């Protein structure tokens, strides 16, 4: 109960629910003094798996942005991918016809802690299911909105690598837990294709349902396991990054992965993994057979322990808990849930590789939290800038004639500032930072401060050498992504419960006909009153009679000048 | 590590590529063997020694050109063969990777132990390249080839008692085929189902000794910090850049260009900041910049040989700032003929690597703008008006000389004023040429005199003093 | 206004402002020159002397710049520049005007193309005497006899230019000044004049191209320091220091230089086509510094490097052409700092590992080179500065 926050008492409540929720296909709601379990029913059919209508190889469906938008990357803007059938069950159990946002909200009134328990193609809605009241109604108060829990048994594997990307990133992966033992087909049933299985779905998942081909099916269940196995860690050490893209187009692989708390439990023991890579290598090793003799029991032993789930209630205390990231000396702990040897180190690796990711944030936040690095945005927004302000002229146009000195001193400490801000955002993009750097304040305040002072200089300096008439217009291409990453990173963080190229837009628009570039000017001008108040563009700056968009404003014409909001001169 | 080439070899066991391939080259077996299979996922085909290749060149040219016709499809090509079908397959796939795009598909070639003599001096060209990526050579653990001056190239598949491990360093491939040529040739085929029983397998040995495994590791390090470290540098160049920038500002102020200052104070050094600018301003850019080329032109940063646009947008600035100080020097030696036999290949592969892209931009000019900071489109250009001046001295030296040398000397001086009319026209050259103590006006002081009678538009331009406002607003 | 902050300072420092008069007006000095004329001249210590420089800098009375980012070191203030305005030039100038010319110590004689001053012809027994010639200058001057001059500084304008004769006539001179300021490289000749003159210690010569054997022919004991800057190439028993910075012709150095044995100091500095050291450097007795700062053209350094016994500080700079170091520096002992900013292209020999106590300054990559060897060499002070990006080098344009 300590390394996942549940006791004894709810996964009880939630089995019970769960069993109980098999007749009716429909929900089963259970009131327990505070507690209101929901128990999402199970599907067994060849269309719960895979839907009839995606005719893709892997069930795959972007989420909408506008039903989910916290589950995307606010760098590149990748959407996250889930199972087409599992959300088709969602939003057709979320419908007004059945009442579950009713109950919900008021579950959500009055009683708190709102755990969502359910079986193995249950587990699958309960995750989404929760998923979506984290976004609906915790993301809007964290303290208001209790923390909801989840608790799955077996259920198989929903959402990508985007997915266990934004759990991490927002912080949400606590709240989800998925028991899973040493041989249950269902939750490595997603990692195999389609086609592969086509024919055996049917009898086999008619077979789990309560109330030869086994054999095969289970085989090529583990091949198209292994695949994924050895393509995952090949990818996560870079061992041969020419060869994996050429082997990469020949065929295709699941991309499904392993998202929130997973509990591995045995006859005696229960091993509880947070790590979302390790899991994926540790299934295909705990799934394979010591010895032929169980080999041959192999699939009669994975069929019939896929409901042996209730024996995990009744023997949780006798059972021993440890916690494999955080303690060391995993070598026993793995070795006796039935792993070999080889697997081993390769579960090491995927740890240590978390660690050295922490260590690099560690060497990140030592180097920001330094006062040389400091020191030259002090100089840049106490010095350069009021001693700019003092003549008749903004710190755009000093830059851009370049007469005095300081001029190269503002070179120099923002070419400095901009290698290790692109030296930054190159670790954080090649998967080597955490997911929680990006969701952190200090870092976003840290850009944002960034780039309201280094990108008008930036323009300056780009429009100054002529280089937009080789390198076209600057707002297409030539604009360095460091400022995207942080200007969306602000809005997603603003926005959660540009004015930089400001300038940008006035060197396009001057020395143009009035009559072509109508909208762009006013919408220019009803944009910059709010970035005037808002913090984006400074007041003071921008209406200095030196200024170059005083002069743009004058040599506008006077029909627009006198209608204009921008009034003041 | 070893473990990671034990897993690269397990899934590529399991793709079902080596099983296949084998199969087919079989049963094609049951001179030089052409193949026209085709598949639903991919093409894959059997060719099965410079005779041999020269022999049949119709042939490889039509099912190069047929190749080049399937991979426009989007469709992955393999050829594959025997002992000798693998190097005829591997000499065949070199041969089409020069007209193949590495944007499209790139062909893979599989070689079931195919012995081939090459030397270093072609190792070299791709011992970093993605060639290396192309050819895939997997041999037995009993089997070895005996090579004293041959070079294995690519990466090399090794198979052993259990599974099958990937080897992608030159050194560790030459170091595990030390020992002497098998003349005995297992089957393939035992090969492939002791793999695949290896990979059903749940424990697989480690069969790559430390001393094997501790140089690739300790290479990756550095081979894979020098591209960070020359990233880390990029921006201490541009720092470089900056002061040269200012070195020319301030060279302006006085009426004189900067390729002029440049080639007046390299005969006589003085004021101790030319010598600077020459000397640590300009050998750390060189040396950078020529590294960078080199290092982009073995192997790419991205896909159809593109490096990053940071890297060669800055380098176009590189060249046409920095090029002029590379012409002073080489015609202050005596030598001529710049253009064309002087010019370094750096300067030229970012030339093209620039206007391969420069296509699809959408830039746009406007006459009002002003040109005193603009650069010269055409860094050749000062390496055009030195040797003009070669023969208009040679035209006033000379006394004696045959009337044909003549005419052809005054065509040289007709094409170059006619190519400098051209590039004044279009705006394209920078306007601190017409200054007083400039290059530019010495020549055109030496040809006033020699031009006389004849008369255009340009010795027009010139004597209205029309040059003062071109490049100003 | 002048007269009175002069008589605020300290008498030795109003002294020393008054002397520095001596150069010509609107020129940019180096700072080694005034430090190694006023340690001569005035016999104070070089340290107290350049903490006058600071205070008078702090005065306003005299500007000081800095040219190269490293810090200020025992006895090299070369990169330090040192320019006065021309109202404070001026009114230092005016100072003492009712004094005789050979009554007053400074004097100033200012020569005509082939005119001479009426102070030539007569005797002056000033001690600070300083001749100007213009180029039109054909080195035609009243013959004096003036044995009290102890220091002589010439400012030459001409392309060939003769040494006086009355050269020889001086008895107690201690420091001899030329510099060319011209435009082309001064040609010399008559050297054995200070070949008479047996008490000179200290000679500097700027933009002059002479042999470099002639100066060996002189044979003169009481020298001790020799400096040339931008020169186109049992004599010396106590020269102990010879500066040579940035000499452009340089492809070889001398066979003279090394056969001395009483230098302690030998700075090769901005000599960018100096590729190879001779063998017989290291039959140097106590060279104590050896600086090879800028010469980006170096190569690797010869091997008698590890004959140096007595060699305490090694100046290695930003030698981009330095690509090997000896095979054996653990036998230098007495080595306590070494400085490799800017140039790693060199790999670290296993010597390293055998040295201990180094006080190491380098930048980040060299520092992040040299922690390699940091747990097995014992307690290296690895130091990494800061690098200022300065544009004070657009002076000396
Ligand atoms: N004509 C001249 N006349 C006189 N002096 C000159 C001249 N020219 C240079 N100097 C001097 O050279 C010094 C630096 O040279 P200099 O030439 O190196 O000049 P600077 O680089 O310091 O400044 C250039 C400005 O252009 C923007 O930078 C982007 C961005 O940084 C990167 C992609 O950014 P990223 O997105 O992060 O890259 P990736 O992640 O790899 O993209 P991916 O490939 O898709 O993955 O391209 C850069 N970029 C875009 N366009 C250009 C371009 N036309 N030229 C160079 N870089 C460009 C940014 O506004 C910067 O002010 C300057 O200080 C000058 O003193």
């Not at chain 2, 001179?31 to 059997?46: A, D, M, P």
Request: charged fraction near 25%; include cysteine; charge should be negative.
């Amino acid at each position: 109960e300590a390394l996942t926050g549940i006791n004894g008492d709810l996964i009880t409540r939630s089995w019970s629910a769960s069993k109980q929720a098999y007749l009716t296909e429909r929900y089963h709601k259970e009131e327990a003094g505070a507690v209101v379990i929901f128990a999402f029913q199970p599907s067994f059919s060849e269309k719960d798996f895979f839907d009839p209508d995606n005719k893709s190889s892997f069930g795959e469906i972007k989420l909408n942005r506008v039903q989910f938008p916290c589950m995307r990357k606010i760098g590149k803007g990748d959407v996250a991918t889930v199972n087409e059938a599992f959300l088709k069950n969602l939003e057709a159990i979320i419908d007004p016809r059945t009442s579950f946002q009713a109950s919900v909200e008021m579950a959500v009134r009055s009683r708190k802690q709102i755990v969502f328990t359910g079986h193995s193609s249950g587990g699958a809605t309960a995750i989404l299911a929760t998923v979506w009241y984290l976004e609906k109604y915790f993301i809007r108060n964290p303290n208001v909105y209790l923390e909801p829990r989840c608790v799955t048994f077996g259920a198989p594997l929903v959402g990508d690598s985007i997915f266990s990307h934004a759990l991490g990133r927002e912080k949400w992966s606590r709240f989800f837990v998925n028991f899973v033992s040493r041989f249950d087909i269902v939750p490595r049933i997603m990692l195999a294709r389609k086609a592969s299985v086509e024919e055996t779905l049917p009898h086999v998942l008619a077979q789990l349902d309560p109330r030869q081909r086994i054999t095969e099916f289970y085989t090529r269940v583990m091949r198209d396991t292994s695949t994924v196995a050895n393509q995952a860690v090949c990818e996560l050490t870079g061992s041969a990054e020419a060869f994996l893209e050429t082997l990469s187009s020949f065929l295709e692989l699941s991309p499904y992965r392993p998202a929130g708390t997973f509990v591995f439990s045995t006859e005696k023991r229960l091993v509880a993994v947070n790590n979302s890579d390790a899991i994926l290598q540790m299934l295909f090793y705990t799934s394979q057979a010591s010895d032929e003799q169980e080999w041959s029991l192999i699939p009669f032993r994975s069929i019939r322990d896929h409901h042996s789930y209730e024996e995990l209630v009744q023997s949780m205390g006798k059972k021993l808990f440890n916690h494999l990231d955080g303690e060391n000396s995993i070598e026993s702990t793995l070795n006796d849930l039935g792993v070999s040897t080889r697997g081993r180190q390769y579960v090491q690796a995927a740890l240590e590789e978390e660690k050295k990711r922490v260590e690099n944030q560690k060497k990140i936040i030592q180097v920001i939290e330094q006062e040389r690095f400091l020191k030259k945005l002090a100089w840049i927004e106490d010095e350069y800038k009021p001693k700019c302000q003092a003549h008749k002229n903004g710190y755009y146009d000093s830059f851009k004639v370049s007469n005095e000195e300081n001029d190269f001193k503002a070179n120099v400490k923002r070419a400095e500032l901009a290698g290790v801000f692109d030296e930054v955002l190159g670790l954080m993009k090649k998967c080597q930072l955490p997911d929680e750097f990006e969701g952190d304040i200090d870092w976003i305040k840290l850009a944002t401060r960034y780039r309201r002072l280094v990108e008008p200089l930036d323009i300056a300096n780009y429009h100054r050498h002529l280089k937009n008439e080789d390198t076209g217009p600057y707002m297409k291409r030539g604009r360095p992504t460091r400022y995207i990453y942080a200007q969306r990173g602000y809005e997603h963080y603003i926005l959660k419960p540009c004015g930089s190229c400001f300038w940008a837009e006035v060197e396009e628009l001057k020395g143009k006909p009035y009559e072509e570039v109508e909208v762009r000017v006013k919408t220019l001008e009803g944009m910059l009153g709010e970035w005037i108040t808002d913090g984006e563009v400074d007041d003071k700056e921008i209406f200095l009679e030196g200024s170059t968009f005083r002069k743009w404003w004058i040599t506008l014409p006077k029909n627009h000048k006198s209608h204009s909001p921008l009034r003041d001169y | 590590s070893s473990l990671k080439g034990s897993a690269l070899g397990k899934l590529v066991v399991t793709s079902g590529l080596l099983h296949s391939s084998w199969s087919k080259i079989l049963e094609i077996h049951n001179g030089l063997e052409f193949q026209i299979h085709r598949e639903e996922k991919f093409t894959l085909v059997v060719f099965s020694a410079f005779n041999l290749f020269t022999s049949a060149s119709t042939s490889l040219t039509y099912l190069k050109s047929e190749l080049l016709q399937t991979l426009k499809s989007e469709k992955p090509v393999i050829i594959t063969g025997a002992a000798l079908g693998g190097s005829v397959a591997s000499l065949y796939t070199l041969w089409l990777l020069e007209t193949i795009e590495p944007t499209l598909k790139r062909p893979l070639c599989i070689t079931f132990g195919s012995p081939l003599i090459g030397d270093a001096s072609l190792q070299q060209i791709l011992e970093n390249s993605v060639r290396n990526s192309c050819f895939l050579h997997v041999v037995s653990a009993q089997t070895r080839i005996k090579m004293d001056f041959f070079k294995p190239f690519g990466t090399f598949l090794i198979c052993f008692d259990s599974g099958c491990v990937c080897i992608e360093d030159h050194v560790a491939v030459t170091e595990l085929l030390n020992g002497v040529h098998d003349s005995g040739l297992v089957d393939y085929s035992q090969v492939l189902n002791r793999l695949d029983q290896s990979m059903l397998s749940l424990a697989d040995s480690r069969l790559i000794p430390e001393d094997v495994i501790k140089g690739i590791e300790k290479r990756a390090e550095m081979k894979n910090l020098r591209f960070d470290m020359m990233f880390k540098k990029l921006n201490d160049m541009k720092i470089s850049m900056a002061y040269i920038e200012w070195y020319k500002k301030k060279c302006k102020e006085v009426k004189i260009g900067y390729y002029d200052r440049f080639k007046t104070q390299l005969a006589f050094p003085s004021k101790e900041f030319d010598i600077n600018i020459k000397n640590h301003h300009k050998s750390e850019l060189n040396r950078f910049w020529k590294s960078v080329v080199e290092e982009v032109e073995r192997r790419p940063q991205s896909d159809a040989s593109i490096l990053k646009r940071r890297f060669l947008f800055s380098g176009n600035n590189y060249r046409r700032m920095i090029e002029p100080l590379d012409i002073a020097e080489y015609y202050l030696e005596g030598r001529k003929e710049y253009r064309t036999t002087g010019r370094s290949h750096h300067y030229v592969m970012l030339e093209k690597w620039f206007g391969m892209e420069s296509i699809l931009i959408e830039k746009e000019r406007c006459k009002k703008r002003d040109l005193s900071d603009l650069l010269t489109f055409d860094s050749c250009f000062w390496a055009e008006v030195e040797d003009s001046l070669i023969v208009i001295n040679q035209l006033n030296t000379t006394v004696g000389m045959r009337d044909d040398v003549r005419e052809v000397l005054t065509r040289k001086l007709v094409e170059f004023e006619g190519y400098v009319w051209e590039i004044i026209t279009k705006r394209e050259v920078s306007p601190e040429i017409f200054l007083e103590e400039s290059s530019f006006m010495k020549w055109w002081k030496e040809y006033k005199k020699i031009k006389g009678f004849n008369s255009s538009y340009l010795t027009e331009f010139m004597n209205t003093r029309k040059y003062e406002s071109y490049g100003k607003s | 206004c002048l007269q009175p902050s002069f008589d605020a300072l300290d008498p030795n420092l109003k002294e020393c402002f008054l002397d520095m008069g001596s150069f010509l007006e609107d020129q940019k000095i180096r700072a080694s020159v005034i430090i190694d004329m006023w340690v001569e001249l005035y016999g104070k210590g070089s340290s107290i002397l350049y903490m006058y420089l600071e205070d008078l800098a702090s005065q306003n009375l005299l500007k000081l710049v800095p040219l190269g980012t490293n810090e200020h070191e025992d006895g090299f203030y070369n990169d330090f520049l040192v320019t006065q305005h021309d109202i404070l030039r001026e009114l230092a100038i005016c100072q003492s005007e009712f004094k005789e010319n050979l009554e007053r110590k400074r004097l100033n004689l200012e020569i005509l193309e082939n005119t001479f001053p009426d102070w030539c012809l007569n005797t002056i027994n000033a001690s600070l005497l300083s001749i100007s010639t213009d180029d039109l200058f054909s080195s035609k001057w009243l013959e004096m006899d003036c044995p009290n001059v102890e220091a002589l500084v010439l400012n030459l304008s001409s392309s060939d230019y003769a040494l006086p004769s009355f050269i020889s006539g001086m008895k107690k001179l201690k420091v001899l000044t030329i510099t060319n300021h011209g435009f082309y490289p001064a040609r010399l000749s008559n050297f054995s004049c200070l070949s008479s003159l047996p008490n000179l210690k200290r000679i500097r010569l700027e933009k002059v191209s002479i042999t470099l054997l002639d100066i060996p022919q002189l044979q003169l004991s009481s020298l001790k320091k020799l400096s040339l800057v931008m020169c186109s190439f049992n004599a010396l028993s106590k020269l102990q220091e010879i500066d040579i910075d940035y000499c452009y012709d340089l492809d070889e150095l001398p066979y003279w230089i090394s056969e001395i044995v009483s230098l302690k100091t030998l700075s090769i500095t901005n000599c960018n086509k100096l590729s190879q050291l001779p063998e017989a450097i290291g039959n140097l007795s106590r060279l104590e510094v050896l600086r090879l700062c800028s010469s980006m053209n170096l190569s690797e350094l010869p091997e008698a490097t590890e004959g140096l016994s007595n060699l305490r500080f090694l100046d290695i700079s930003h030698c981009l052409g330095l690509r090997k170091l000896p095979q054996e520096i653990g036998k230098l002992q007495n080595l306590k700092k070494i400085s490799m900013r800017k140039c790693s292209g060199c790999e670290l020999p296993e010597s390293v590992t055998n040295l201990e106590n180094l006080e190491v300054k380098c930048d980040e990559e060299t520092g992040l080179l040299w922690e390699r060897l940091k747990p097995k060499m014992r307690n290296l002070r690895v130091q990494e500065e800061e690098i200022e990006h300065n544009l004070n080098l657009l002076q000396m344009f």
